[PDB]
Amino acid sequence: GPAVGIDLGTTYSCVGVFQHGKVEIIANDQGNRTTPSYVAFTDTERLIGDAAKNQVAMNPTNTVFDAKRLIGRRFDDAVVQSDMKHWPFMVVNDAGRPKVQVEYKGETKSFYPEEVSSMVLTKMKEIAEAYLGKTVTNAVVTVPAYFNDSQRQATKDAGTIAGLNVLRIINEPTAAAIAYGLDKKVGAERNVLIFSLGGGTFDVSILTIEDGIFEVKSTAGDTHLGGEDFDNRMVNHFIAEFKRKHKKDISENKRAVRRLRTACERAKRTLSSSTQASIEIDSLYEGIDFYTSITRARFEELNADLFRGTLDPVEKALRDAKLDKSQIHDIVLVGGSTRIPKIQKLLQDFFNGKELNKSINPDEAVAYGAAVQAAILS
Ligand SMILES: Nc1ncnc2c1ncn2[C@@H]1O[C@H](COP(=O)(O)OP(=O)(O)OP(=O)(O)O)[C@@H](O)[C@H]1O
Numbered sequence: 001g002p003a004v005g006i007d008l009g010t011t012y013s014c015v016g017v018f019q020h021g022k023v024e025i026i027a028n029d030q031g032n033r034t035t036p037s038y039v040a041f042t043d044t045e046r047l048i049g050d051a052a053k054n055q056v057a058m059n060p061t062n063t064v065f066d067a068k069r070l071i072g073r074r075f076d077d078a079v080v081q082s083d084m085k086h087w088p089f090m091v092v093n094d095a096g097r098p099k100v101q102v103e104y105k106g107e108t109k110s111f112y113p114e115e116v117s118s119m120v121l122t123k124m125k126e127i128a129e130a131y132l133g134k135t136v137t138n139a140v141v142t143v144p145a146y147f148n149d150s151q152r153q154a155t156k157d158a159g160t161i162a163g164l165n166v167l168r169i170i171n172e173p174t175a176a177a178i179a180y181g182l183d184k185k186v187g188a189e190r191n192v193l194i195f196s197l198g199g200g201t202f203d204v205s206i207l208t209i210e211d212g213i214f215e216v217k218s219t220a221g222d223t224h225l226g227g228e229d230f231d232n233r234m235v236n237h238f239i240a241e242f243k244r245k246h247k248k249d250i251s252e253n254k255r256a257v258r259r260l261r262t263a264c265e266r267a268k269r270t271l272s273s274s275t276q277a278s279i280e281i282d283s284l285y286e287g288i289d290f291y292t293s294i295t296r297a298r299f300e301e302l303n304a305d306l307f308r309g310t311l312d313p314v315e316k317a318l319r320d321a322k323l324d325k326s327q328i329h330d331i332v333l334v335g336g337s338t339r340i341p342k343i344q345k346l347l348q349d350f351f352n353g354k355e356l357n358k359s360i361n362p363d364e365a366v367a368y369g370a371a372v373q374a375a376i377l378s
Contacts, residue, residue, distance in 0.1 A: 001132065001134045001135050001136050001137060001138075002017050002018065002019060002132065002136075002138075002374075002375070002378075003017075003138035003139060003140065003167060003374035003375060003377065003378040004016065004017045004124075004125075004128050004136055004138070004139050004140075004371060004374055005017070005018070005023075005139070005140050005142075005175070005367050005368070005369065005370025005371030005372070005373060005374045006121070006124050006139055006140070006141050006142070006367060006370060007142050007172070007175070007364075007366040007367035007370060008037070008068065008117060008120065008121065008141055008142065008143075008155065008158075009034075009037055009068070009198060009199070009366075010037065010066060010068045010069065010198060010199060010200045010201055010226075011036065011037060011065070011198060011199025011200050011226070011227070011228070012034040012035065012036055012037060012198070012199055012336065012363065013034065013035055013036075013037050013120055013121075013123075013124055014033065014034040014035075014124075014363065014364055014366070014367035015124040015125075015127060015128050015367055016364070016367040016368050016370070016371035017128060017131075017132065017371055017374075018371045018372055018374065018375035023179075023368050023371045023372060024131075024371075025361075025364045025367060025368060026127055026128055026131045027127075027131075028049065028050065028123075028127045029049075029050070029127070029130075030050045032050060033361070033363075033364060034336075034363050034364065035049040035050060035120075035123065035124070035127070036049055036050060036052065036053040036065075037065060037067065037068065037117075037120050038052035038053040038056070038063060038064070038065050038120075039052055039063070039064045039065075039067075039116050039119045039120065040052035040055060040056070040059055040062060040063040040064070041059075041062045041063075041064075041102045041103065041104040041105075041109075042059060042062065042104075042105075043105055043106060044105065046104070046119070048119055048120065048122070048123045049120070049123050053065075056258065057254070057255050057258035057259060057262075058255075060088040060089075060254070060258075061088055061089055061090070061102070061103070062089065062102045062103055062104070063088070063089065064089050064100050064102065064111075064116055065087075066083070066087065066200070067100070067113045067116040067117050067120075068117070069083055069223075070083075070091070070098050070100070070113035071113040071114060071117060071151055071154045071155060071158070072113075072114075072147070072148070072150040072151030072152070072153060072154035072155070073098065073113075073150070073151070074096050074097065074098070075091075075092075075093040075094075075096055075097060075098040076093075076096065077098075080098055089101070089102060090102070092110060094110065094112075097112065098112075098113060099111060099112055099113075100113065100116060113154065113158075114154045114155075114157045114158040114161065115158070115161065117154075117155070117158035118157075118158040118159070118161040118162040119162075121141075121158055121159055121162035121164060122162045122163070125139075125162060125163070125164060136164075137163070137164065137165050138164075138165050138167050138374065138378055139159065139164045139165065139166055139167065139374060140166070140167050140168050140169075140170060140370045140371075140373050140374040140377065141155060141156075141159050141164075141166055141169055141370070142169070142170055142171065142172045142175050142366050142367075142369075142370050143155050143169050143170070143171065143172065144171065144172050144201075144203060145171040145172065145173055145174075145203070145205050145216050145219050146203075146219055152169050155169060156169055167374060167377045167378065168373070168377060170370065170373060171205075171214075171216065172194075172196065172203070172334070172366050173192075173194035173196065173203070173205035173207055173216070173334075174207065174214050174216075174369070175365070175366045175367075175368075175369030175370045175373065176194050176196070176332050176334045176365045176366055176369055177192050177194070177207055177209065177214065177332065177369070178369040178372050178373055179332075179360055179365045179366075179368040179369035179372065180330070180332055180357050180360070180365075182209060182330055182332075183209060183212060183214070184212075185211060185212050188210070189208060189209070189210040190208070190209045190210070190329045190330065191206060191207070191208050191209075191217075191321075191323060191327055191328045191329050191330075192206070192207045192208075192209060192328070192329065192330045192331075192332065193205070193206050193314075193317075193328045193330070193331045193332070194206075194207065194332050194334055195314070195331065195332070195333055195334065195335075195338065195347060196221075196334035196335045196338075197225075197226065197227075197310070197334075197335040197336075197337035197338050197343065198226050198227065198334075198335035198336060198337060198363075199226045199227045199228055199335075199336060199337070200224070200225075200226035200227070200228055201221070201222070201223050201224070201225070201226050202221040202222040202223075202225040202226060202310065202313065203219065203220075203221040204219065204220045204221045204313045204314055204316075204317045205218070205219045205317070206218045206219075206317055206318070206321045206323065206328065217320075217321040217322075217323075218317045218318075218320040218321035219317065220313040220314075220316045220317040220320070221313045222313060225306070225309075225310075226335075226337060227265075227268070227335075227336055227337040229306060230268060230303050230306065230337070230340075231261055231264045231265045231268060232261075233302045233303050233306070234264040234267070234268065234294065234299070234302060235257065235260055235261050235264055237294075237298075237302055238260055238264070238279065238290075238292070239251055239257075239260075241292065242284070242285070242290060246285075246288055248285055248286070248288070250284065250285045253285060256284050256285050259281060259284065260279075260281065260284065260290070263279045263280075263281050264279070267279055267293075267294060268299065269339075271294070271296045271299050271340075272339045272340055272341060274296070275295060275296045275297075276293055276294065276295040276296065277293060277294060278291070278292070278293040279291070279292045279293060279294070296341070300342050303342075307340075307342055307343055307346060308346065310343065310346065310347075311346065311347075311350055314347070314350065325350075325351055325352065328351070330357060331347070331351060331354060331355075331356050331357060332356075332357040332358075332365070333356055333357065333358045333362045333365075334362050334363075334365050334366060335362050335363060336362060336363040338358070338362040339361075339362060339363075344356060344358070
């Protein structure tokens with residue numbers, strides 16, 4: 001069986017396989033090329049992926065996500081302490097190790113973050129197996145450049161418990177560079193900038209590649225800035241509109257809010273291609289249908305400060321790496337959020353018109369690169 005490349009993201013995961021000199025990004029059961037890093041526990045079953053996210057508003061306390069934020073950390077970890085204040089599921093301390101506590105089939109059960117991720121990993125494996133028509137064992141899993149040894153360890157373990165023989169754990173920016181072939185020897189040193197803006201995190205990495213060896217010269221970004229923050233701005237915008245039209249504040253109703261958020265996220269994707277999208281939600285609050293729409297222009301102004309602030313970490317990365325704008329040779333977009341036109345304009349304007357590498361779907365670039373690497377490693 002071929003070795004596969006797996007991008008284990010904070011919000012979405014993606015799997016690809018190298019076959020006949022071409023990389024195949026494998027779609028799932030619902031035909032999506034990336035699947036939510038969601039796991040859900042109910043009275044009768046364990047849901048994973050799309051099925052899990054498709055019922056989150058109906059089972060918030062038993063639907064787990066953001067496991068990538070817990071993986072490899074200690075319960076006492078300041079990050080953990082700050083984050084758990086926002087999760088609808090329980091996080092308990094087990095001799096210093098954080099554990100997620102959920103109710104499965106009427107019984108109370110807890111899981112280590114690596115066990116949850118192994119679940120998402122299992123779903124990717126079977127997605128690949130369903131496509132390949134053969135058993136998948138060897139794999140290359142990616143991890144952010146800033147992950148320490150514990151985090152890499154935990155990610156490796158999540159893979160082994162998923163029945164995957166992890167050939168190697170490589171950095172996400174490095175995988176991205178490999179996808180574009182920027183690892184090829186050209187008898188010269190090349191500076192590559194990876195701009196990764198996913199569903200929940202923002203990373204900027206400057207890699208220096210010479211003789212085929214990568215050297216992460218600098219990194220920056222924000223661990224709490226991603227596509228979900230954009231959705232939230234839309235949500236707050238529509239809560240206000242609903243109130244204008246029906247003098248009904250739907251903020252208290254968690255279900256209404258979550259249904260609207262899903263509508264927004266979807267409208268947002270449409271906005272990357274069209275100039276306006278419509279929000280059609282039957283019986284949002286009480287029995288009031290919420291039919292409306294947004295234009296790309298309004299979407300941009302709702303998120304203006306957020307989009308603009310994206311350049312702050314870019315400047316920082318440059319100064320730390322001791323390089324000027326003119327010194328970076330290539331720029332590659334990674335993450336679903338980079339499909340946003342305004343973000344592409346902003347970055348390009350910042351680099352005085354330089355062309356951005358974006359021919360490969362940004363949310364597939366990391367998996368794409370890992371698949372190539374997996375192939376060579378086997
Ligand atoms: N066409 C699009 N336009 C805008 N955003 C999009 C588009 N397609 C997907 N996205 C967004 O990209 C995000 C998911 O990104 P991606 O698949 O790169 O995540 P990820 O690797 O899990 O990232 P992170 O680990 O930072 O969350 C979601 O916020 C989704 O709404």
